[PDB]
């Protein structure tokens, strides 16, 4: 019942793996995630823009504006 509720996860002998119950939100743009593993190796590189939105009885006569990244330089070295 009600409005906009979200239940719990991983309880009462929890188990499994994943991503769940996201409303109006953003996940990424250069990110690594590792749990319960042996000798993981991960590389990520991103040039990105992300925009998101959720509205109930709302988001009315409104506005959301974004200009992306422009004109940058970046250097990351080695890992031996």
Give me the least distance between CB of 23 and a copy of itself, in Å please.
5
Dist. CA 29–CA 23, nearest whole Å: 18
Report CA torsion sign: 43, 19, 4, 10: negative
Q: Which residues 37-66 are close enough to bind a copy of itself by CB under 8 A? A: 37-66
Residues touching a copy of itself: how many (CB under 8 A)? Answer: 80
Give me the least distance between CB of 31 and a copy of itself, in Å please.
4
Q: What is the dihedral of CA 31, 19, 49, 25, to 10 degrees?
A: -130
Q: Which residues 4-33 are close enough to bind a copy of itself by CB under 8 A? A: 4-33
């Amino acid at each position: 019942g009600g409005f906009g509720n979200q239940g719990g996860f991983g309880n009462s002998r929890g188990g499994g793996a994943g991503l769940g119950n996201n409303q109006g939100s953003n996940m990424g743009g250069g990110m690594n995630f590792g749990a319960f593993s042996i000798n993981p190796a991960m590389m990520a590189a991103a040039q990105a823009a992300l925009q998101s939105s959720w509205g109930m009885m709302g988001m009315l006569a409104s506005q959301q504006n974004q200009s992306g990244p422009s004109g940058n330089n970046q250097n990351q070295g080695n890992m031996q």
